Symmetry: C2
Subunit: 411 residues, 2 copies
């Protein structure tokens, strides 16, 4: 206020001005005192070293650190706190304090999994920066310390979580990058980093864990570094999961944008390995349990895993290429499948596919040259069969189709 | 017959003339269902007012709730019908109906003899992972397990046995512990925690096993900060019916002392820490250690000013109370021990320096007047403390000791009545 304007006229000592404000009897709550802002202003006008010295004879360095840290949080003392944090940093640097000791100073020992939440974290990192540019010969990475304090997985989680809050979003990602590289230089195998990230601890929920993408990112850098040791990433998964559950996981993962691109590739790998083993489209059809007559498997992801494999099988064996309605006719029967699709047409979930499938079954019949009494025979119909029965409907719709395709009947 | 009551407070549009037409003619619920084309309505069926109209009409011709769902069971798959009803339960405009139907579906699954495992997969809680208790259909499934357990006691199965076979102990615990703070789920969650403990008891696993299991080895000086520690404590107290000896075999006595004294100030771990510190005390007395052995042990014998906000000092005063009430007559003192280990001069500068920092001035001032008082009782004169504070003529007034001396004489001047003795 106008106090300063009086003290300047008189010539009052900064010490006396500090005393006249009773700031020597102010507790840990010192910064909230506007009298401190006014005195700190008075001191600037005759610098930053002095404020910090006087505060350093009334507050322990560690405690002062916290006070300044939380002092940056108040809009009214943002400036002062920063200048003081810089002076304090400069002092620690000159005094030659280790990064380990500043770490103790700020009591980050005792913040565990909560470190990046701790408000005095940036205090310590800014110190490590300053120390590293003043003492390059004995310079030490921030990360090397974190990595020395926490095991790989805990550190990973802390980081992964810390980039969610923007205040630290940048730094966390930076450190995440360093962590990966730190594994590379440490000569860790993809298997070690695999177990390290606890991906064993995951079940059929592997591609649902974000650390899996981290491990993939690791293995594709590991493969480029040392390709005399490069690994088949599908071969590990194949050594630790069933073909059925692995198929399920892969087809699910293929529909999440994050994992879409690695899941597609890996399912390709599965296809190709199934082909090299001698599995046929019918082998895989049975494998994926598609021959058990649940009607829900008409929209099943198992079906997409299968049509994927079918696609793969065909481009190998040209000329001898299979079909979905062909395979469904093979495992269920003509009658069986007719029943199946007709039932499918009732439920909303399966109504498009079944219809799409039904006419397919009709087309196969038409080209095979099946006549009305042939299908009547092969649906095992009787005269006293209700027209409302599944097959008795299918049969009719086939007659409408056949009657609407007199031209193609050449086949 | 709940459903009839709900369609009283229901807003119909024209909707109620359709129904009254159907009552007049007498048209069947089935044909009335056909005339509304609801057999071709699909997954957004509940948003369709014609469903409201048909369900109201069905209430007007019957337990109608059995029929509605039955009809719905021929147009929608079991799982999908479940899900639809679930999200129908979320919108205020279709609530009674949705809940009542969810109950009917429950009973139908029970009658059909469905396993709890199959209802579990149906509601897709298999594909819900550590998020299970967050899931809106968790309670659906628990209601099924209840209904199934009262229908088939011979084939009854605990909810917990399923959770416990699906998740490992630690993740399950974290899940429970997290869900119990969520108020919607606390009650059931807490039951499961009890059962988990009980399930460890019956599975005959060791206290060491439950210890390692709960991830407590790489807790360090931060053991009492992980809440699962209480879970393990609670375990051993059910198991016995010696915890300090275990803690003593895995920690030094000084960090253990600090940890306990700290733990005594968090309400959760308070009282177990109090008790365990009691055990440390008693074990400290039974070996024969005296207050100075412990003082030195606890690193208190060096004049660090940080010993003024230290928990170790408090651990020490704890042991002092304990020693004093045992070894009676030969009772030690705080200022005595500080005078013995630091020296008169040493302790004097220590406290004087302590008085400046806001951090330590309470303790430092109380201790200071303590030291002054002991000086007075001993009959130490101005020139005596001047002598042993090793002060000189040319000593600056601002030196610690040079202040102490002054403070003592001022103390002496306001206490001379008592000084008569």
């Amino acid at each position: 206020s106008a106090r300063i304007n009086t003290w300047l006229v008189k010539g009052t000592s900064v010490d006396d001005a500090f005393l006249k404000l009773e700031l020597n009897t102010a507790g840990s709550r010192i910064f909230e005192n506007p009298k401190l802002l006014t005195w700190a202003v008075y001191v600037t006008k005759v610098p930053e070293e002095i404020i910090l010295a006087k505060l350093s004879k009334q507050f322990t360095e560690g405690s002062l650190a916290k006070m300044i840290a939380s002092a940056k949080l108040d809009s009214k003392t943002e400036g002062l706190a920063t200048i003081l944090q810089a002076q304090q940093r400069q002092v620690w640097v000159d005094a030659g304090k280790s990064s380990d000791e500043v770490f103790k100073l700020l009591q980050l020992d005792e913040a565990g999994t909560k470190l990046f939440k701790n408000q005095q974290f940036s205090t310590w990192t800014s110190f490590v920066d300053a120390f590293n540019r003043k003492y390059p010969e004995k310079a030490v990475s921030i990360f090397s310390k974190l990595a020395k304090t926490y095991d790989g997985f805990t550190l990973w989680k802390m980081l992964e979580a810390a980039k969610k809050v923007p205040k630290t979003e940048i730094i966390a990602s930076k450190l995440q990058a360093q962590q990966i590289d730190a594994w590379l230089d440490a000569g860790k195998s993809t298997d070690e980093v695999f177990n390290l990230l606890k991906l064993q601890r995951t079940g059929d929920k592997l591609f649902k864990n974000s650390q899996f993408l981290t491990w993939v990112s690791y293995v594709e850098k590991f493969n480029k570094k040392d390709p005399d040791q490069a690994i088949a990433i599908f071969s590990k998964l194949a050594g630790v999961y069933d073909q059925v559950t692995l198929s399920s996981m892969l087809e699910a993962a293929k529909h999440v944008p994050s994992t879409k691109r690695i899941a597609s590739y890996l399912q390709g790998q599965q296809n190709q390995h199934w082909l090299a083993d001698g599995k046929s489209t019918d082998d895989i059809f049975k494998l994926l349990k598609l021959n058990t007559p649940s009607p829900e498997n008409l929209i099943d992801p198992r079906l997409d895993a299968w049509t994927s494999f079918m696609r793969a099988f065909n481009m190998a064996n040209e000329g001898k290429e299979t079909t979905l309605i062909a395979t469904l006719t093979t495992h269920y029967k003509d009658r069986g499948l007719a029943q199946l699709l007709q039932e499918g047409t009732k439920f909303a979930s399966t109504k498009k596919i079944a219809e799409e499938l039904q006419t397919a079954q009709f087309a196969r019949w038409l080209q095979l040259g099946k006549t009305e009494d042939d299908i009547f025979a092969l649906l095992k119909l009787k005269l006293t069969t209700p027209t409302t029965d599944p097959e008795a409907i299918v049969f009719y719709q086939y007659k409408l189709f056949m009657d609407a395709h007199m031209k193609l009947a050449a086949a």
